[PDB]
Design an enzyme around this catalytic site. Structure first.
Site, short mmCIF file in Angstrom:
data_model
loop_
_atom_site.label_atom_id
_atom_site.label_comp_id
_atom_site.label_asym_id
_atom_site.label_seq_id
_atom_site.Cartn_x
_atom_site.Cartn_y
_atom_site.Cartn_z
N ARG B 14 69.09 17.99 51.24
CA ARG B 14 69.91 18.44 50.12
C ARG B 14 70.53 17.26 49.39
O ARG B 14 71.04 16.33 50.02
CB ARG B 14 70.99 19.40 50.62
CG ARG B 14 71.04 20.70 49.84
CD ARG B 14 71.69 21.82 50.64
NE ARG B 14 71.68 23.08 49.90
CZ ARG B 14 72.04 24.25 50.42
NH1 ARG B 14 72.42 24.34 51.68
NH2 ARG B 14 71.99 25.34 49.66
N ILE B 15 70.47 17.30 48.07
CA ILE B 15 70.92 16.18 47.25
C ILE B 15 72.41 15.91 47.45
O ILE B 15 73.24 16.82 47.46
CB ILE B 15 70.62 16.43 45.76
CG1 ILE B 15 71.01 15.21 44.92
CG2 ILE B 15 71.31 17.70 45.25
CD1 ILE B 15 70.62 15.33 43.46
N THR B 207 57.05 -22.80 38.27
CA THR B 207 56.35 -21.60 38.70
C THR B 207 55.30 -21.82 39.80
O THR B 207 55.28 -21.06 40.77
CB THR B 207 55.67 -20.91 37.49
OG1 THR B 207 56.66 -20.55 36.52
CG2 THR B 207 54.94 -19.65 37.94
N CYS B 223 50.08 -29.41 34.63
CA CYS B 223 49.85 -30.19 33.42
C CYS B 223 48.91 -31.37 33.68
O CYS B 223 49.08 -32.12 34.64
CB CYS B 223 51.17 -30.69 32.83
SG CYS B 223 52.05 -31.93 33.78
N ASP B 230 34.30 -42.47 23.68
CA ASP B 230 33.37 -42.26 22.57
C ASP B 230 31.92 -42.29 23.05
O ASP B 230 31.14 -43.14 22.62
CB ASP B 230 33.61 -43.31 21.48
CG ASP B 230 32.82 -43.02 20.22
OD1 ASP B 230 32.62 -41.83 19.90
OD2 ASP B 230 32.41 -43.99 19.55
N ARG B 260 34.16 -41.40 17.43
CA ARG B 260 33.93 -42.00 16.12
C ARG B 260 33.70 -40.93 15.06
O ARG B 260 33.39 -39.78 15.37
CB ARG B 260 32.75 -42.97 16.17
CG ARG B 260 31.40 -42.31 16.36
CD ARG B 260 30.31 -43.33 16.61
NE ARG B 260 30.43 -43.95 17.93
CZ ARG B 260 29.49 -44.70 18.49
NH1 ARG B 260 28.35 -44.93 17.86
NH2 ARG B 260 29.69 -45.22 19.70
N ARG B 267 23.68 -46.34 18.08
CA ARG B 267 22.69 -47.31 18.55
C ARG B 267 22.08 -48.09 17.38
O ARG B 267 20.87 -48.29 17.32
CB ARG B 267 21.58 -46.62 19.35
CG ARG B 267 22.03 -46.15 20.73
CD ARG B 267 20.86 -45.61 21.55
NE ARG B 267 20.24 -44.45 20.91
CZ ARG B 267 20.68 -43.20 21.05
NH1 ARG B 267 21.73 -42.95 21.81
NH2 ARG B 267 20.06 -42.20 20.44
N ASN B 435 51.06 -34.41 26.73
CA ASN B 435 50.51 -33.20 27.33
C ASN B 435 50.55 -32.03 26.36
O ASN B 435 50.69 -32.21 25.15
CB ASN B 435 51.25 -32.85 28.61
CG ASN B 435 52.69 -32.45 28.36
OD1 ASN B 435 53.39 -33.08 27.56
ND2 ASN B 435 53.14 -31.40 29.03
N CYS B 437 52.85 -29.73 26.02
CA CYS B 437 54.17 -29.43 25.47
C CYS B 437 54.92 -30.68 25.00
O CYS B 437 56.10 -30.60 24.66
CB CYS B 437 55.00 -28.69 26.52
SG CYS B 437 54.24 -27.16 27.13
N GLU B 439 56.08 -33.53 26.32
CA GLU B 439 57.18 -34.18 27.03
C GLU B 439 56.67 -35.20 28.04
O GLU B 439 57.43 -36.04 28.53
CB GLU B 439 58.07 -33.15 27.73
CG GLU B 439 57.60 -32.73 29.12
CD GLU B 439 56.61 -31.58 29.09
OE1 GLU B 439 56.01 -31.33 28.02
OE2 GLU B 439 56.43 -30.92 30.13
N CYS B 460 51.55 -34.77 36.51
CA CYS B 460 52.99 -34.89 36.65
C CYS B 460 53.59 -33.66 37.33
O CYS B 460 53.34 -32.53 36.92
CB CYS B 460 53.64 -35.11 35.29
SG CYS B 460 55.31 -35.81 35.38
N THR B 622 60.41 -19.69 31.63
CA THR B 622 60.28 -18.89 32.84
C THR B 622 61.21 -19.40 33.93
O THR B 622 61.97 -18.63 34.53
CB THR B 622 58.83 -18.89 33.37
OG1 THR B 622 57.96 -18.31 32.39
CG2 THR B 622 58.73 -18.11 34.66
N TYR B 728 57.70 -31.32 19.08
CA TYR B 728 56.97 -30.14 19.54
C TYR B 728 56.96 -29.05 18.46
O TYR B 728 56.61 -29.33 17.31
CB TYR B 728 57.61 -29.62 20.84
CG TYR B 728 56.79 -28.61 21.61
CD1 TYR B 728 55.40 -28.61 21.56
CD2 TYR B 728 57.43 -27.65 22.39
CE1 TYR B 728 54.67 -27.67 22.28
CE2 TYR B 728 56.71 -26.71 23.09
CZ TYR B 728 55.33 -26.72 23.04
OH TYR B 728 54.62 -25.79 23.75
N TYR B 729 57.34 -27.83 18.83
CA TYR B 729 57.36 -26.69 17.92
C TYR B 729 58.15 -26.94 16.64
O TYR B 729 59.17 -27.61 16.65
CB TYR B 729 57.99 -25.47 18.61
CG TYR B 729 57.16 -24.79 19.68
CD1 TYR B 729 55.77 -24.87 19.69
CD2 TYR B 729 57.78 -24.05 20.69
CE1 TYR B 729 55.03 -24.24 20.67
CE2 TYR B 729 57.05 -23.42 21.67
CZ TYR B 729 55.67 -23.51 21.66
OH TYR B 729 54.95 -22.88 22.64
#
Ligand SMILES: Nc1ncnc2c1ncn2[C@H]1C[C@H](O)[C@@H](COP(=O)(O)OP(=O)(O)OP(=O)(O)O)O1
Ligand SMILES: Nc1ncnc2c1ncn2[C@H]1C[C@H](O)[C@@H](COP(=O)(O)OP(=O)(O)OP(=O)(O)O)O1
Ligand SMILES: Nc1ncnc2c1ncn2[C@H]1C[C@H](O)[C@@H](COP(=O)(O)OP(=O)(O)OP(=O)(O)O)O1
Ligand SMILES: Nc1ncnc2c1ncn2[C@H]1C[C@H](O)[C@@H](COP(=O)(O)OP(=O)(O)OP(=O)(O)O)O1
Ligand SMILES: [Mg+2]
Ligand SMILES: [Mg+2]
Ligand SMILES: [Mg+2]
Ligand SMILES: [Mg+2]
Lengths: 733, 734
Positions: B14-15, B207, B223, B230, B260, B267, B435, B437, B439, B460, B622, B728-729
Site C-alpha cells: 500500500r502506497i 574524461t 590529443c 612533403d 608543396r 623529380r 592540436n 583545440c 592549447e 599530452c 565536460t 581558438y573559437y
C-alpha cells in the site's frame, strides 16, 4: 608575287607546285582523293610571309577534314602529310638519321636509357638499322599519327618538340625487351618482334609504347588489391592505392571482407561504424593524385551480393542522396554466384550476412559452391546469427536499376571465375577483378604497405590484331613473340610495393587479348547477333589460347616454369577445354583443330612460364594505331568523330570501301543475345575474363524504357553461357 | 488509499507518501529555499496503481531537477542526491556501498576492473584504503555532475545500462592505479592525498582517465599532433597514424604546411603536383574513417602558413558556397602567422606567396629564426626565377578573418610567439603546430612510415586545477605535486599504438595542466574580465601555478631523473618563462614576483625537470561539470545554463549565484575582447604551452548589426601585441 618563309627562316617566292609535289607523293596508291580540292581549301589561307610549316599544317587539316565514307583514303593522305611534318620536326629533314647516331644523341639528351648503349654495340645498332623500314610510317591512318604525336613519340613536354619517329620507337621497344637474350638469338628476336608491331600484328599498351626505351621503369597500368577486415589492412590498402595511382595505374579493390555496420569489435569494446566511411577513404586515396574530375584516378570496388550492407552499397553512385551515403567517383562490381541466381529464379529470398558473423562462408563463396550452399543454409536457420532477409527479385532489380542508370555497376560471377580457371581455388582463389573487369588473378591482403606476405596482382597486357593476320596459324609465331616480350618486361619493370613484385615474380601472369574483332567478322561475312559467328569465334579463340599456351610452355622448357606454377590447374593436367560451361555445346559445334592432348602432357612435364596468358581487355587508344575496331566491340558508326586539343579527328572503320554492308553497327543489333553468346564462346578458352558490355536502345522498346525483365533476362543469359564478368552498360540517347 | 506501488523485488504494498517524504527529507538536509511539498505536488499527480518504486524515484528526481533556478539553486543538490540514491541501489542493491576489497574482487571477476589491482595491493591494503574513502562526498555533487558520472564516467554495461560502481570507488581506484608502482613507504600516503584532491574537487581529471583508469583499457591519449612531410610515404604514414588514433577517440592536430603547392615539379619535372586540397580530403576521410554520421565523431585541425601559395584557396575550405571539389568542410584550420606578416598589414604593403619546395630554409626559419626568415623572405621576393604570387596584406588578412567570422573555426597561430617564448630550443625542437583545440604546443617530426622510429608524434596528458576550490594559492604546492606525479605515472601506464608517439611521450614526458572555475575565481575576489581589474590577480595566480608546477616536476626529477630529452629544452640552459615573455605585458601588469624563481632556476640547472612542459589552458566543458565549475577561463553565458540531452534538460547554476550574482560578468555583458585578451596574455607569461582563447562578438552592439572588419583586425593585433600564441573559437551571438 607573294613570299613564303622557309623552315630555316629564309624567304623565297611562293611556288604552288611545291605544295602540289608533296600532295602527289602522299596520294600515291590512294583512291578517290582530289589534290585540287585540298589545294583549293588551303590556298585561300595564304598570306605574305606565311611559314612553310604553317602551309603544311593547312593542307594537313584540309585533307583531314575530307575524311569521309565516300573517300576514306583521305585518312592516309592526311596521315602521310603529318608524318612528313614530324620527320622535319625531329630530324630537320625527311630521311631519318642512322639508328646509332640517333640513340647516342637521345641518350645524351637523357631521353633514352643508357643501357641501350651498354647492351648493344655500334655494329649491332648498324645491323638493327637494316631491319627498319621507315616507309612503314606511310601505312598509318591519320588518327594513328595523332596518337603517336600525342602520347607515344618521345618528346619534350615543355615545348612540344618531337624527338623521334615511329619506326625508331618500334625497333627500340624490341631491342629493350630482348636485350637480355643470348647473342645467338637476340637480333633474330628483335627483327621478328619489330616486324610484328610495325606491321600491326601485335598491339602494345600505352605505357609500353611511350615508356620502353626511356629512363622510366613504370609500366604497370593494372593493379588488384585485396583489403583485410582490419585497420592495419585498410591503411595498407590505402597506401598501396596512393602509390599506384601516382603511377597512373587503374585499381581493383576488394573490400568485401570489411565487416558490416554495427558489428562488434574486440568482443564489444567498440562497434563498427560501417563500410562506407572506409570506401570514402579509398576514394580519396584513388583521387589523391588528381586535379579536377576529368580523369585521373580510376578504381573499381568489389563486394559480395549477400553482404549485410549491400542495399546501401548498390546505390553509392546515383546523383540523388546526401554526401554521407554516396561514394560516386568509384565504380563497383557486385559478386554473385549460383545460389543467388537460384533464389532469383525460384522467387525465393536472399539472406544478408556480415562476413565476420559467418565462419567459412566468405571463402566458400569463391572456392567451394557445394560448401557455400551448406554453410549458407546452415546460417539461415541459425537464429543467433545476425542477418537480414530480402526478396531476391527486389535485390537484383535494385542492382540492375543502378547499373542501368549509372552504367558503372558491374557483375562478377565468382563461381565461373573459379570452376573455369587456371588456378586451384583451394590454394589461390580468384576473389576480384580489375578496373575494366578482364583481369582475374589471386590476391592476399596486406597488414602493412611493405608486407612481404601480402599479394597484389599485376598483369602485363597486349593484343593480337585479328584484322592483320591472314591465317590463324600465324598466331604460333605471334604468340611466341608476344609471350616472350611480355615475360621479359616482368623482369624489366620496377615494383613500388613488395606484395606486387611477389605476385609478378611468383605467377608471371600475362593478359593478352584481341583487337579488330568486328572487322575480322565482316571479312569472313559473319555478324554478331544472328549466331553466324559462333563457330568462327570458337575456331579463332581455340587457336589463340593454344598457341599462347604452346609458346609459354616452350618458354618454360627454356627458362623454367614460374615459381608458383604448382598452384595452377594447369599443373594438375587440367585445360580450359575440360572445365568450360557445358551449355556452350548448344550454341557451338566447331571441333578442336589442335592437338590439345599433346599439349596437356607437355605442360605436365615442363610447365608454363606464365600462370595466365589470355584476357580480353578493352582498347580505345591502343587500337587507333592499327586503325582497328575497338577490342571485341562492334563500332557505333562507319566514321568516328572525336573532338580534341588539335581539332576534330575522323577515323573510318578498316576497309569500309568493300565492307560497308558487311559491318554490323552497334545500334543495328536486335539485342544482346548474339554478342553474349560470342563472349561465352570466347570465355571457353580465355584464362582470365572479358570486358563484356551490355547495350540497350530505349527506342526499340515500348514506352521508350528498357523493362527490368529484359535486363534480368540478359543477365541470366550471360550466366547461362559461363560469362564471368559484365562491364559497361551503354544506353543510347 | 486504494493505491498500490511495486517494490524493487517485485512485491507490492500500500502506497505510503511518508516514505517519499522521508527520502526527500534526507536529500534536502542542509539545503535552503527548497520545498519538499512542491516536489511532492508535482510528483504525486503522476502516480498510478502498481507503479514501480524506481519510476516513482525518477519522478521526484525530474521534479526536483526542473525546479533548479536562480531563486532556488539548491535544487541542484536535491536532485543530485536523489540521483545518487538511485545509482547506489542500481549498483549495490542498497544505499551503503560494500567494502572496497569485496567490491574490487567482484568487479575483477566480471572483467570490469583490471586484474593488476589485486596483484599490486593486498587485502589489508584495500581495507586500509577503505578507511580513506568518504562515501558521503557523493552528497556534494550537483545534478549536472551526477548525470555526467552516470553517463560517461561510472563503470557500466553499455548494453543493459547497468551501473556497477559509485563515484568514490572511481576516485579511490584512479588513485590506486596511478600510484601502484610507488614504494610501500609512501605509496598509500600518496593514494590518500590524491583521492582527497579529486573527490573534494581540487584537481579535475580528463574524461579518458575518469572512465578508463582501473578498467582493462590502456587507451588514454585524447590529443595527438602529427606533422606531415612533403612525400607520398609521409602522406601515407600521416593518414595511417590518423586512422589509428581517431579509432581511439583522439583529437588530431595535423601540420600539412610542408606539402608543396599545386603545379610544383616532381623529380625535376617527371610529374607535377596536383594540389594540397586532394591530400587534405584524404586526411579528412582518415579522420572520419571511424565515424557514423556527422554528429561529433572524428575531429581534427589542420595547420598551414599564411604565406603558402595556395592560401587563398585553403582559407575558404570550410564555407558553404562552392562545389565539393574545392571544399574540405569537416576539419578545422589554423593559419600560421608571424611578425613580418603583421608588419605588411600595418604598413599596408603586400604579402608574397610561396611554395615551401621553392624556398630553401624559409619554412624552417618561419618557426625557429625570425631574423633569418626576414632575410630569406626578402631575398626570395626579389628573385624573379622563383615562383611566387603577390597579394595585398589587408586583402589576405580580411579573407582569413572573413572565414573565421562566418565559420568560427578558422584559427590563428602566432608561430614566432610559440618559439621565442617556449620551453623548447627552436633550433633543435621547434614548435611547428598545435592540436585540435589550440592549447598544445609541442615539437614534432614527420614520419616516412607509420612505424618509423625517427618520426615524432606529440602527445599530452591533461588535467586542471579548480581555482574555485582552493582557499589560498599556497595550496597549489601540494596539488602540483599530486597532479604532476599522477600524470607522469600515467605516461608509463598508457599504451602507444604508434612508435613515433611513444618516442615523443617517453622522450619529453610532456604534460598539460590547466584551470577551471576562473570566472568564479574572479567573482570571488570582486574582479572582472573587461575593466583590467583582474590583471594583477591573474599575474599573481598564474605565477603561483607555474612555479609550483615547475617545483613539483623539478623534485620529481631529483627522485626519478629528468626526461631523456630534457637537454632540448630552454629550461636545460637556465631559461625561465619569466625571461622570455612579451615585454608589452609590463604596461598592463605591475604585480611583482612572489616566489623565488632564481633558486628554482639553479635547481632546474642542477637536477632538471621530469617533464618538458607542464602547463596548458585547455577548454573544459565536460570535465568542469563534475566540479560544477565555470568552463576553463571562459566567462559563463548565463547564470543558469540550459542544455538539452538524451536524458532530458539539464540545468546548471553558476557556483554561489546566491551571493555573487552581481559579481559575475556574463559573456555578452562585456564591452569587447580587450580585457579578456589582456588576461590571456598575462596567463601566457607563465604557461608553458598555449591557451584556448576565444573571441566573442555581439552584432547588436555594432552599427548596422554587422561586426566590421576593422574591429576584427584590431582585436587580432591586440592579441599579438600581448604575446598571445593562438586564437581558438570565434563566437558570434545570434
Ligand atoms: N616556295 C614555296 N612556296 C609554297 N609552298 C612551299 C614552298 N616551299 C615549300 N612549300 C610547302 C611544301 C609543303 O607543303 C610545306 C613544307 O615543306 P618543306 O620542304 O618541309 O619546307 P621547307 O622547304 O621550307 O624546309 P626544308 O629546308 O626542310 O625543305 O611547304
Ligand atoms: N574504433 C573503431 N571504430 C570503428 N571501426 C573500427 C574501429 N577500430 C577498428 N574498426 C574496424 C576496422 C575493421 O573493419 C574492423 C576490425 O578492426 P581491427 O583493426 O582488426 O580490430 P581488432 O583486431 O583489435 O579486433 P577484431 O578482433 O574485432 O578484429 O573494425
Ligand atoms: N510503499 C511506498 N509507497 C510510496 N512511496 C514509496 C514506497 N516505497 C518506496 N517509495 C519511494 C521512496 C523512494 O523514493 C522510492 C523507492 O526507493 P527504494 O527504497 O530504493 O525502493 P524499495 O523500498 O521498493 O526497495 P529496497 O528494498 O531496495 O529499498 O519510492
Ligand atoms: N603522381 C603524383 N601526382 C601528384 N602529386 C604527387 C605525385 N607523386 C608525388 N606527389 C606529391 C607528393 C609530395 O607532396 C610531392 C612529391 O614527393 P615524393 O612523393 O617524395 O616524390 P619524389 O621523392 O619521388 O620526388 P621529389 O624529389 O620531387 O620530392 O608531390
Ligand atoms: Mg623543302
Ligand atoms: Mg582484428
Ligand atoms: Mg526501500
Ligand atoms: Mg620527395
Amino acid at each position: 608575287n607573294l613570299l613564303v618563309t622557309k623552315r630555316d627562316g629564309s624567304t623565297e617566292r611562293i611556288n604552288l607546285d611545291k605544295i602540289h609535289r608533296v600532295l602527289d607523293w602522299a596520294a600515291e596508291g590512294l583512291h578517290n582523293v582530289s589534290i585540287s580540292q585540298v589545294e583549293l581549301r588551303s590556298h585561300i589561307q595564304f598570306y605574305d610571309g606565311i611559314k612553310t610549316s604553317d602551309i603544311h599544317e593547312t593542307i594537313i587539316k584540309a585533307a583531314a577534314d575530307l575524311i569521309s565514307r565516300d573517300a576514306p583514303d583521305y585518312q592516309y593522305l592526311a596521315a602521310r602529310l603529318a608524318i612528313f611534318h614530324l620527320r622535319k620536326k625531329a630530324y630537320g629533314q625527311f630521311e631519318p638519321p642512322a639508328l646509332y647516331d640517333h640513340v647516342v644523341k637521345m641518350v645524351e639528351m637523357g631521353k633514352y636509357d643508357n643501357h641501350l648503349l651498354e647492351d648493344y654495340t655500334e655494329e649491332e645498332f648498324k645491323q638493327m638499322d637494316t631491319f627498319i623500314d621507315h616507309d612503314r610510317d606511310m601505312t598509318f591512318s591519320y588518327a594513328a599519327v595523332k596518337q603517336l604525336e600525342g602520347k607515344y613519340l618521345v618528346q619534350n613536354r615543355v615545348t612540344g618538340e618531337i624527338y623521334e619517329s615511329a619506326q625508331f620507337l618500334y625497333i627500340l621497344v624490341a631491342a629493350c625487351l630482348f636485350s637480355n637474350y643470348p647473342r645467338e638469338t637476340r637480333l633474330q628476336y628483335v627483327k621478328r618482334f619489330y616486324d610484328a608491331v610495325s606491321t600491326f600484328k601485335i598491339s602494345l599498351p600505352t605505357p609500353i609504347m611511350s615508356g620502353v626505351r626511356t629512363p622510366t621503369r613504370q609500366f604497370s597500368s593494372c593493379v588488384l588489391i585485396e583489403c583485410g577486415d582490419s585497420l592495419d589492412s585498410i591503411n595498407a590498402t590505402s597506401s598501396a592505392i596512393v602509390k599506384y595511382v601516382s603511377q597512373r595505374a587503374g585499381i581493383g579493390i576488394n573490400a568485401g571482407r570489411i565487416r558490416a555496420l554495427g558489428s562488434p569489435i574486440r568482443g564489444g569494446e567498440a562497434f563498427h561504424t560501417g563500410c562506407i566511411p572506409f570506401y570514402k577513404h579509398f576514394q580519396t586515396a584513388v583521387k589523391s593524385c588528381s586535379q579536377g574530375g576529368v580523369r585521373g584516378g580510376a578504381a573499381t570496388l568489389f563486394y559480395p551480393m549477400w553482404h549485410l550492407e549491400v542495399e546501401s552499397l548498390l546505390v553509392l553512385k546515383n546523383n540523388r542522396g546526401v554526401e554521407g551515403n554516396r561514394v560516386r567517383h568509384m565504380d563497383y562490381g557486385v559478386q554473385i554466384n549460383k545460389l543467388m541466381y537460384t533464389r532469383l529464379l525460384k522467387g525465393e529470398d536472399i539472406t544478408l550476412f556480415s562476413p565476420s558473423d559467418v565462419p567459412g562462408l566468405y571463402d566458400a563463396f569463391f572456392a567451394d559452391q557445394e560448401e557455400f550452399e551448406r554453410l549458407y543454409t546452415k546460417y539461415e536457420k541459425d537464429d543467433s546469427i545476425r542477418k537480414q532477409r530480402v526478396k531476391a527479385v527486389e535485390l537484383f532489380s535494385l542492382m540492375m536499376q543502378e547499373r542501368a542508370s549509372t552504367g558503372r555497376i558491374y557483375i562478377q560471377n565468382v563461381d565461373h571465375c573459379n570452376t573455369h580457371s587456371p588456378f586451384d581455388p583451394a590454394i589461390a582463389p580468384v576473389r576480384q577483378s580489375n578496373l575494366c573487369l578482364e583481369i582475374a588473378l589471386p590476391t592476399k591482403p596486406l597488414n602493412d604497405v611493405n608486407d612481404e606476405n601480402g599479394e597484389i596482382a599485376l598483369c602485363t597486357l597486349s593484343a593480337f590484331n585479328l584484322g592483320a593476320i591472314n591465317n590463324l596459324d600465324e598466331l604460333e609465331e605471334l604468340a611466341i613473340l608476344a609471350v616472350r616480350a611480355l615475360d621479359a618486361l616482368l623482369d624489366y619493370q620496377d615494383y613500388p610495393i613488395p606484395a606486387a613484385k611477389r605476385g609478378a615474380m611468383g605467377r608471371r601472369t600475362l593478359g593478352i587479348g584481341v583487337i579488330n574483332f568486328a572487322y575480322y567478322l565482316a571479312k569472313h561475312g559473319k555478324r554478331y547477333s544472328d549466331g553466324s559467328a559462333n563457330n568462327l569465334t570458337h575456331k579463332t579463340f581455340e587457336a589463340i589460347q593454344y598457341y599462347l599456351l604452346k609458346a609459354s610452355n616452350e618458354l618454360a622448357k627454356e627458362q623454367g616454369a614460374c615459381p608458383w606454377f604448382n598452384e595452377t590447374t594447369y599443373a594438375k593436367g587440367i585445360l580450359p577445354i575440360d572445365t568450360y560451361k557445358k551449355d556452350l555445346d548448344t550454341i557451338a559445334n566447331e571441333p578442336l583443330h589442335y592437338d590439345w592432348e599433346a599439349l596437356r602432357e607437355s605442360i605436365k612435364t615442363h610447365g608454363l612460364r606464365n600462370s595466365t596468358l589470355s584476357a580480353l581487355m578493352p582498347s580505345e587508344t591502343s587500337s587507333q594505331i592499327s586503325n582497328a575496331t575497338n577490342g571485341i566491340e562492334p563500332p557505333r558508326g562507319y566514321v568516328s568523330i572525336k573532338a580534341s586539343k588539335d581539332g576534330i579527328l575522323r577515323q573510318v572503320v578498316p576497309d569500309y570501301e568493300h565492307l560497308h554492308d558487311a559491318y554490323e553497327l552497334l545500334w543495328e543489333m536486335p539485342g544482346n543475345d548474339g554478342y553474349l553468346q560470342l563472349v561465352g564462346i570466347m570465355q571457353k578458352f580465355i584464362d582470365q575474363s572479358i570486358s563484356a558490355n551490355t547495350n540497350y536502345d530505349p527506342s526499340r522498346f515500348p514506352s521508350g524504357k528498357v523493362p527490368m525483365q529484359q535486363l534480368l533476362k540478359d543477365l541470366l543469359t550471360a550466366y547461362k553461357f559461363g560469362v564471368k564478368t559484365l562491364y559497361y552498360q551503354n544506353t543510347r540517347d
